[PDB]
Amino acid sequence: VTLCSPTEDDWPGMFLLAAASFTDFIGPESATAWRTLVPTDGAVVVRDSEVVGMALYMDLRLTVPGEVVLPTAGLSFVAVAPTHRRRGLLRAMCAELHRRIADSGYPVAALHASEGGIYGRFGYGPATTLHELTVDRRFARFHADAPGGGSSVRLVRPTEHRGEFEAIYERWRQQVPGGLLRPQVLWDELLAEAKAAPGGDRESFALLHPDGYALYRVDRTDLKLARVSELRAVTADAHCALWRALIGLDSMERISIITHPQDPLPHLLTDTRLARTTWRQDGLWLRIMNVPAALEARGYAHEVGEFSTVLEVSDGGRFALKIGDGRARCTPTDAAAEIEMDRDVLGSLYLGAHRASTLAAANRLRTKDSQLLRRLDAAFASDVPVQTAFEF
Amino acid sequence: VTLCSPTEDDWPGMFLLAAASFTDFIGPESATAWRTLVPTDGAVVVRDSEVVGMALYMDLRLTVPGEVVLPTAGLSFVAVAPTHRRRGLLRAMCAELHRRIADSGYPVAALHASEGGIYGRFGYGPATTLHELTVDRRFARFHADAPGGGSSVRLVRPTEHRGEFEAIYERWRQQVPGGLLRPQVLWDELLAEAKAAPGGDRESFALLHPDGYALYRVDRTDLKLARVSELRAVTADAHCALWRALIGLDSMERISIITHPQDPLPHLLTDTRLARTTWRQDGLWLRIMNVPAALEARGYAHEVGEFSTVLEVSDGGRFALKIGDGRARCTPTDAAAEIEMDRDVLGSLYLGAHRASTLAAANRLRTKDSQLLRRLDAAFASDVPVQTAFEF
Amino acid sequence: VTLCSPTEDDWPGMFLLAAASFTDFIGPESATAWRTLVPTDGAVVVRDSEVVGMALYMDLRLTVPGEVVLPTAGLSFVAVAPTHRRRGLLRAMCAELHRRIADSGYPVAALHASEGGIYGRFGYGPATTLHELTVDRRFARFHADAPGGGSSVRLVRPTEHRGEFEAIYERWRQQVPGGLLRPQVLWDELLAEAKAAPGGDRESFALLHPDGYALYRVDRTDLKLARVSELRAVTADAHCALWRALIGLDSMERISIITHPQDPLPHLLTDTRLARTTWRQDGLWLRIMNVPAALEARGYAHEVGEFSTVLEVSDGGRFALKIGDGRARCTPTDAAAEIEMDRDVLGSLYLGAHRASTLAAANRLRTKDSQLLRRLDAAFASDVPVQTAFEF
Amino acid sequence: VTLCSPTEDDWPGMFLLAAASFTDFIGPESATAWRTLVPTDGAVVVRDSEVVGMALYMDLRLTVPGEVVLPTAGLSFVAVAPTHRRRGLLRAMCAELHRRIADSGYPVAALHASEGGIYGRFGYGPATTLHELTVDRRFARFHADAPGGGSSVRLVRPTEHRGEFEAIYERWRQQVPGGLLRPQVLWDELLAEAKAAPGGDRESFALLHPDGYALYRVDRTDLKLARVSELRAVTADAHCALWRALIGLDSMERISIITHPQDPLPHLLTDTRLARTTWRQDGLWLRIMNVPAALEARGYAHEVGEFSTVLEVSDGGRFALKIGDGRARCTPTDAAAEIEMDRDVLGSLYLGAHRASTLAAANRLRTKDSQLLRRLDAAFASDVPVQTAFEF
């Protein structure tokens, strides 16, 4: 077993491992479009020869609180052959890619986890929360207060309005923590999946507003369920107008969407309970590669007064952290730690999805000052709720 | 149709309406113990004679942020006969009880809603969130950081340790927003439901720690599911120790609990995803009866700097609101409103369960200042997460 | 194996066979109340000794078209031990009871069939149709035309209004084909089943109108389903008023009832489709014991002009049948048959539930005259739709 | 929003609205074959431009009692964009098409309803009843009386016997109320759907008798269920022979068919209960456009003696109605009404599927004469049971 950057010759062995590892694997042509986002030296393989392990990262741009955009290494396509389990292949592949990612100057790495038990030990913390809402649209009535009581929304074919979707998404990704730049190859892929497949997905339709769009398709087996694959709204008016149109799908019983915990939809209805939470899971995981670069790069809440503390990340350094006027300064120190946590915990705090107080109650974050805990909670809170852009 | 305080003679007609209206109705003897909490003039009936409508409130004590305890009117036992629907009976009964509640000096009313679409129009807003977590305990391993790695926890018969449960709950209710005083008749009722019933519930067991207790019973139909009816933990150590014991129920596959969104349990595990959110619904609803008395009574976040605004509640007054050093002053004004909302929206903000920004995005809260929105969000936030005490 | 009238000593052996044969068997005390309706010589047993077969009939009064009431032998409690199958016990028991029934002067026998394949060969034809309607009452709105848009309906405890139920049912049974006299022991039994059982049925409630009553109970497992056990309405106004009250059970999702195919309920609603047919099965089976006495006793449709034919029942005689002015005369003849059918087919025609044309299309009824078929269809039609009274 | 006859340019916008509105939408090529049946001026669109509403009618021939064939406007392809709900688009489109249909000389309009609550208010009444029968063919034995105890039935490929299917269906449609002429484009469509689809329907087979045919296919998911899409039998012998062959599908557990309430199948079996009613819904809806032309065109039952009455249709005229010798005369009058009903109720009576007495019991039909009700019931009854031809 040796660990190497793959040559062109390795890619069929990687596609075989992929097919056998990932049921969602569309196939070589689709993976060749995601390959464009992978830099030179972005991939490792383990050969025994034949490919028994692989892992890569893609070049991404991730929006963090304060509308700051970070270069982000997106780990993906990670697989160990079922023949080579418990041989330390994952550990060796993650250590090598992390070395390259850190040396390349990325302040943050990110991934979507296939199981919740794997990535904590490599320093990844769950940083966004997926929340499925299912609306029984037969009972749904809009509240007297809800905006937009002509329609500004049009029912359209997605492929005929690519430009408008691209422009609305670009505005949304820059203003929302969790937003990711979507490269044009990923618009190619998205619009190809919109098409219906024999024995596969049904055709996707779009609802298009000047300041938002919703992409939806009827479920293959449940013909009374419409699944919203993506709703991007830049204004509250756009969000309400799009939900008025979705609730107008009179041939459906139910509309489902994978959204975020602060989605205002339930509050648009006279019965908030009609927007049922049917599923809840971790979305984007973060590994802070460079603690000072990450902490200094994001914006903090202006509401909390200036405060100074000493933060120790387990095997990640100790820092004098001063937060004031929405900005952090984070410098080396050997002064006594006032706060300690593993690297994964910092990733979970970083976008505002998890409260320092919640993590402290599990002893994942350790402090003897409850006042400092309240200050951390308030300062790391995000004004714009954190959302999940697209899986990678 | 006349509306009156019931006489002793009305109570059998009320118990008949109850039996026909509420499947959860245990029976007259149980309802006679809840009757003790109902003050003189706490009940209304509509006669046609026979009882075709009823509603009452109970005298409760509700903990709000800052560990402040308010006298609270708990509306319950509300029913209209299926023979007298759409005759305005509910509207007439709610108006009369609200008049009595306000005249009696209660700053707040509260209820548990049988449907989500009814109570908004009478000024009640959902104020707590029930979150069911189901753990697949066969995979559950505690994180290296989790506290308590002899056991301080004992498996006991609930009826033999009444004193210790009473004392732990008393400490928990005073320190937790949402906490309710539990009167001794309600301890009588709770310990009677612990007993097994032929063709009914299985026997309840307790796990008892010096600083917490968990009451649980195996599901009647699912013999591999244990349902935690109540876990009250005064310290993080007590919470972790109790979950170590629950995960040690080796004959179960699954442990379920109705908890709150900030329950630290998922963070105690190496796989956070094992604590699945299987259900989510509104818990306690609040109607603010007296806006200035309620706003002045609770504590606010010390992190946010002093600020002044003008709040209009639709048909509930306009107030100069000044929040500083964790305290509010709320005085009459005819100055221009900077914030407007219906009374129900204020109830939803009051315990910290809903963000002003979230309600603003649905246009339930109206302001032209985004800075004021961030300040309201931060100030109404609760340091101790809001929990739901017990249904009434 | 001998066949005898049971002595008092045989009854425990019969109750043992009953318990082992009938899952619906309430027990000896309940069966001892049904025993009162069984005449001297109304029962047979086969001993091997131990009881290996039994069958009995009860003295009933059955309403047929024209509001005519016939003495009816109600066969029931029919069982062969699982140890003595395929020994001709059923055939021997049915032949003996039929001999006694015919000799006693009963023009008709009736039963409720545990399977559809058994009773045709002994001359029983299905004569009524059970139709389960399930209403999704959350969508149900009454049509502008529906009657009864104070309520004349009261929600009551069944046991407190026995007299009123008895009187309404007496009026309904006399005016409805299929009606059966309900003896007071059967009112005792009905009101005992109204009571809730630990691990059993939930309590029954009644809706009481001057001209109808509905008995209903929440399903033991489905707490959002109310099952109407019995709705007896003497007027259309009573029927509509009772359904307005049932649709007002706001805590239920669904109301189900076992009714008849001509129940007007669907036509009371703006959406007829909301009253879904979820189940359909044979109800009351008839064996015509004496062809001329039965055909002469019922009323026929006044719309059809006088006509004469010759009817042959297979092994049941040949008759000159003259139908005019709503009356039949049915006399012996050896003239050529114009219509032939097995005895079971006549039972199926007798109350109007099945069309002669439908049975002719299956060749269960044989004629070469299509005009005679149309005349039979029209003449045997019932003005008041046929309903099923109560199982026996 | 303007309302217009579509130009060729509007049809892609209509196909987009169709795809988004109808999950059963096969696609443009299939809809272009149904377009042939749509006359010039048979279609309306609402533009906002883009298509936000559409509705059309097709030229059909409908068989009514007496084997009379009426020109019938078949409304279909009716959709409002989910963006333009509650703007009166349906009302405006139905009013315009009804104006054109009436002016064109159609005595009747018809449709298949996607929901039961929409079409009553535009004067459409449900006129046929779909009844799904599911037979457990493992228990099914034919009665000694059933016809056809060599087989006259052949198992064939539908596409190889098009001529014979066309000829049998032509005979059946002319002799059965509810029958519709099937144009050759609809035979093209039917035989194309017979072919199997990858990830779609399995191949269809036919059973062919000189006087009937059955088209059936194994269910895609349930491989032990055969679904009969269509059984057309001109004689009872053909019906019995076809069911003998279907019950001979020894690899199936269950045969299901969508038939009519008077299907003789259950009576062909020794156990009638084996032919279970698993589904029941409205089939064809009728709007009587011209009351006198429709009432005069159909045949009436010869059994009922001559009678005269005065019928008022709400906003549809008042008529002296004389029914005798199977014929009606229906002339204008201002004499006092003896019978009143909304137009939709007349459509429900017109083919014999609903009894005047049943509609009277719901107060949809109003009279003070019970004798007149019995006469209407008998006269509007259909000798040949009403069946549903094919959906449009």
Ligand SMILES: COc1ccc([C@H](CN(C)C)C2(O)CCCCC2)cc1
């Ligand atoms: C060649 O590099 C990649 C990277 C990612 C992908 C896929 C992205 N999907 C979200 C469409 C993936 O789904 C990632 C998980 C493993 C299967 C393939 C493809 C190629």
Ligand SMILES: COc1ccc([C@H](CN(C)C)C2(O)CCCCC2)cc1
């Ligand atoms: C007589 O006053 C009351 C008030 C409340 C109750 C019950 C409380 N449960 C939580 C045990 C209730 O469950 C409230 C909802 C309606 C049914 C009865 C009883 C009597």
Ligand SMILES: COc1ccc([C@H](CN(C)C)C2(O)CCCCC2)cc1
């Ligand atoms: C002793 O005679 C009888 C006759 C009938 C019964 C019961 C009647 N039920 C409808 C309550 C029966 O249900 C009939 C079927 C067999 C089981 C008992 C009892 C005793």
Ligand SMILES: COc1ccc([C@H](CN(C)C)C2(O)CCCCC2)cc1
């Ligand atoms: C272009 O005109 C029409 C009319 C009807 C149809 C379809 C007929 N099916 C029964 C095959 C329809 O199914 C009707 C309901 C809406 C979807 C399409 C097609 C085109």
